[PDB]
Design an enzyme around this catalytic site. Structure first.
Site, PDB file in Angstrom:
ATOM      1  N   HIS A   1       0.826  -1.224   0.000  1.00  0.00           N
ATOM      2  CA  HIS A   1       0.000   0.000   0.000  1.00  0.00           C
ATOM      3  C   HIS A   1       0.853   1.265   0.000  1.00  0.00           C
ATOM      4  CE1 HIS A   1      -3.410  -2.526   0.805  1.00  0.00           C
ATOM      5  NE2 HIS A   1      -2.701  -3.069   1.794  1.00  0.00           N
TER       6      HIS A   1
ATOM      7  N   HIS B   1       6.175   6.343   6.803  1.00  0.00           N
ATOM      8  CA  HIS B   1       5.741   6.031   5.448  1.00  0.00           C
ATOM      9  C   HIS B   1       5.152   7.333   4.896  1.00  0.00           C
ATOM     10  CE1 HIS B   1       2.288   5.552   8.041  1.00  0.00           C
ATOM     11  NE2 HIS B   1       1.624   6.116   6.992  1.00  0.00           N
TER      12      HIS B   1
ATOM     13  N   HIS C   1       1.953   8.970   2.070  1.00  0.00           N
ATOM     14  CA  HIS C   1       0.813   8.811   1.172  1.00  0.00           C
ATOM     15  C   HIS C   1       1.006   9.839   0.052  1.00  0.00           C
ATOM     16  CE1 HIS C   1      -1.464   6.614   4.325  1.00  0.00           C
ATOM     17  NE2 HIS C   1      -0.636   7.309   5.100  1.00  0.00           N
TER      18      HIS C   1
ATOM     19  N   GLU D   1      -3.439  13.181   3.068  1.00  0.00           N
ATOM     20  CA  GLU D   1      -4.605  12.658   3.763  1.00  0.00           C
ATOM     21  C   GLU D   1      -5.290  13.774   4.529  1.00  0.00           C
ATOM     22  OE1 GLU D   1      -3.338   8.926   5.782  1.00  0.00           O
ATOM     23  OE2 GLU D   1      -4.401   8.109   4.032  1.00  0.00           O
TER      24      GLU D   1
ATOM     25  N   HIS E   1       4.137  10.329   7.369  1.00  0.00           N
ATOM     26  CA  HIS E   1       3.679   9.961   8.701  1.00  0.00           C
ATOM     27  C   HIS E   1       4.788   9.227   9.475  1.00  0.00           C
ATOM     28  CE1 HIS E   1      -0.756   9.885   7.249  1.00  0.00           C
ATOM     29  NE2 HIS E   1      -0.319  11.185   7.558  1.00  0.00           N
TER      30      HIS E   1
ATOM     31  N   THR F   1      -5.209   5.488   9.459  1.00  0.00           N
ATOM     32  CA  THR F   1      -5.917   5.866   8.251  1.00  0.00           C
ATOM     33  C   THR F   1      -5.974   4.724   7.232  1.00  0.00           C
ATOM     34  OG1 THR F   1      -4.004   6.697   7.006  1.00  0.00           O
ATOM     35  CG2 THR F   1      -5.233   8.333   8.479  1.00  0.00           C
ATOM     36  N   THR F   2      -5.521   3.528   7.636  1.00  0.00           N
ATOM     37  CA  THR F   2      -5.759   2.331   6.852  1.00  0.00           C
ATOM     38  C   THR F   2      -6.409   1.332   7.803  1.00  0.00           C
ATOM     39  OG1 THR F   2      -3.682   1.164   7.395  1.00  0.00           O
ATOM     40  CG2 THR F   2      -3.652   2.634   5.503  1.00  0.00           C
TER      41      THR F   2
HETATM   42  C1  LIG Z   1      -0.763   3.552   2.857  1.00  0.00           C
HETATM   43  O1  LIG Z   1      -0.637   3.501   4.259  1.00  0.00           O
HETATM   44  C2  LIG Z   1       0.121   2.605   4.835  1.00  0.00           C
HETATM   45  O2  LIG Z   1       0.748   1.787   4.199  1.00  0.00           O
HETATM   46  C3  LIG Z   1       0.239   2.702   6.288  1.00  0.00           C
HETATM   47  C4  LIG Z   1       0.982   1.694   7.008  1.00  0.00           C
HETATM   48  C5  LIG Z   1       1.001   1.822   8.410  1.00  0.00           C
HETATM   49  C6  LIG Z   1       0.306   2.858   9.099  1.00  0.00           C
HETATM   50  S1  LIG Z   1       0.524   2.919  10.875  1.00  0.00           S
HETATM   51  C7  LIG Z   1       1.334   1.346  11.410  1.00  0.00           C
HETATM   52  C8  LIG Z   1      -0.425   3.764   8.323  1.00  0.00           C
HETATM   53  S2  LIG Z   1      -1.170   5.136   9.197  1.00  0.00           S
HETATM   54  N1  LIG Z   1      -1.440   6.183   8.023  1.00  0.00           N
HETATM   55  O3  LIG Z   1      -0.196   5.637  10.156  1.00  0.00           O
HETATM   56  O4  LIG Z   1      -2.417   4.663   9.820  1.00  0.00           O
HETATM   57  C9  LIG Z   1      -0.481   3.637   6.972  1.00  0.00           C
HETATM   58  C1  LIG Z   2      -2.661  -2.138  13.642  1.00  0.00           C
HETATM   59  O1  LIG Z   2      -2.244  -1.742  12.349  1.00  0.00           O
HETATM   60  C2  LIG Z   2      -1.096  -2.002  11.799  1.00  0.00           C
HETATM   61  O2  LIG Z   2      -0.207  -2.418  12.548  1.00  0.00           O
HETATM   62  C3  LIG Z   2      -0.873  -1.825  10.353  1.00  0.00           C
HETATM   63  C4  LIG Z   2      -1.870  -1.367   9.477  1.00  0.00           C
HETATM   64  C5  LIG Z   2      -1.616  -1.211   8.079  1.00  0.00           C
HETATM   65  C6  LIG Z   2      -0.364  -1.571   7.612  1.00  0.00           C
HETATM   66  S1  LIG Z   2       0.018  -1.455   5.849  1.00  0.00           S
HETATM   67  C7  LIG Z   2      -1.454  -0.535   5.271  1.00  0.00           C
HETATM   68  C8  LIG Z   2       0.626  -2.070   8.480  1.00  0.00           C
HETATM   69  S2  LIG Z   2       2.246  -2.467   7.824  1.00  0.00           S
HETATM   70  N1  LIG Z   2       2.786  -0.977   7.295  1.00  0.00           N
HETATM   71  O3  LIG Z   2       2.114  -3.559   6.749  1.00  0.00           O
HETATM   72  O4  LIG Z   2       3.174  -2.891   9.058  1.00  0.00           O
HETATM   73  C9  LIG Z   2       0.409  -2.162   9.857  1.00  0.00           C
HETATM   74 ZN   LIG Z   3      -0.113   7.102   7.067  1.00  0.00          ZN
END
Ligand SMILES: COC(=O)c1ccc(SC)c(S(N)(=O)=O)c1
Ligand SMILES: COC(=O)c1ccc(SC)c(S(N)(=O)=O)c1
Ligand SMILES: [Zn+2]
Length: 258
Positions: free
Chosen positions: A62, A92, A94, A104, A117, A196-197
């Site tokens: 993502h 990471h 967006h 976002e 972020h 936000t995911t």
């Molecule tokens: C595309 O967004 C991501 O891949 C993404 C991965 C991890 C996190 S927090 C562990 C987030 S977010 N925006 O911090 O909720 C977003």
């Molecule tokens: C509780 O949420 C997470 O830990 C989490 C949520 C989304 C993502 S990717 C969109 C990830 S990640 N960046 O694959 O470690 C981790």
């Molecule tokens: Zn994010």
């Protein structure tokens, strides 16, 4: 049929697997700069990244994560609206398909090209997995990106992306200093929100810096060459991996400045 940002599994669909998508403290939000209240009780943010230990960069399917050693208090965020100590686990971005979208959070409805972020977890809860179950578990520092002059401190990230083009690829990424992604001013807005995911957990104190950083067109173009797909699958460019602004509901956005 997993969630994503494609034509059929995008943000408007997420509530079906994750009903908290329609909850009371979802992120991101539009920041209406006129309505945000200056809060003289808010402290300057303390960003302590001198001992940060980056390890690895991962295409997570993502976005891409730059991961840090968070097995001790090296890189921590404190102060600002926060009580206690939050350890940096990863950052990471967006971003958009076009410079006119990607962020976002929005500011008076303005979209930036991208948004960084820096994700931190509250040490009082011992690990990230426990912290995301708590209303004060995470603090995410959000920084807007606009397209203009290059950000020298971003170039090491840009240059490794061709080695992690597809989902699930990783590369060693040591000695990267996240201080080089910060703007001059640490003036911020803050409000209680969510990931936000999916799983969209309502565990985030958001801190969004007012001052964007400038990146070059060429830098952001290289983000747009990444892929959501795995190796050997038809190409799905990794673009428009942002969730739209969600209803503010019964929340106040506070300003540290003004
Ligand atoms: C595309 O967004 C991501 O891949 C993404 C991965 C991890 C996190 S927090 C562990 C987030 S977010 N925006 O911090 O909720 C977003
Ligand atoms: C509780 O949420 C997470 O830990 C989490 C949520 C989304 C993502 S990717 C969109 C990830 S990640 N960046 O694959 O470690 C981790
Ligand atoms: Zn994010």
């Amino acid at each position: 049929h997993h969630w994503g940002y494609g034509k059929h599994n995008g943000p408007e669909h997420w509530h079906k697997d994750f009903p908290i998508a329609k909850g009371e403290r979802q992120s991101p939000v539009d920041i209406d700069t006129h309505t945000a209240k200056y809060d003289p009780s808010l402290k300057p943010l303390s960003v302590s990244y001198d001992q940060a230990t980056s390890l690895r960069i991962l295409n997570n399917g993502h976005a891409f994560n730059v991961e840090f050693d968070d097995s001790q208090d090296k890189a921590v965020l404190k102060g600002g609206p926060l009580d206690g100590t939050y350890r940096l686990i990863q950052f990471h971005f967006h971003w958009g398909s076009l410079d006119g979208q990607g962020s976002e959070h929005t500011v008076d409805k303005k979209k930036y090209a991208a948004e960084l972020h820096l994700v931190h977890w509250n040490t009082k809860y011992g690990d990230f997995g426990k912290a995301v179950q708590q209303p004060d578990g995470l603090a995410v520092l959000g920084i807007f990106l606009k397209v203009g002059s290059a950000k020298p401190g971003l170039q090491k990230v840009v240059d490794v992306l061709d080695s992690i083009k597809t989902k699930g690829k990783s590369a060693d990424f040591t000695n990267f200093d996240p201080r080089g992604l910060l703007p001059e001013s640490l003036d911020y807005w803050t409000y209680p929100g969510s990931l936000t995911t999916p799983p969209l957990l309502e565990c985030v104190t958001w801190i969004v810096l007012k001052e964007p950083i400038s990146v070059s067109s060429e830098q952001v173009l290289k983000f747009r060459k990444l892929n959501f797909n795995g190796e050997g699958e038809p190409e799905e460019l990794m673009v428009d991996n942002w969730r739209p602004a969600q209803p503010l509901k019964n929340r106040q956005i506070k300003a540290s400045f003004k």
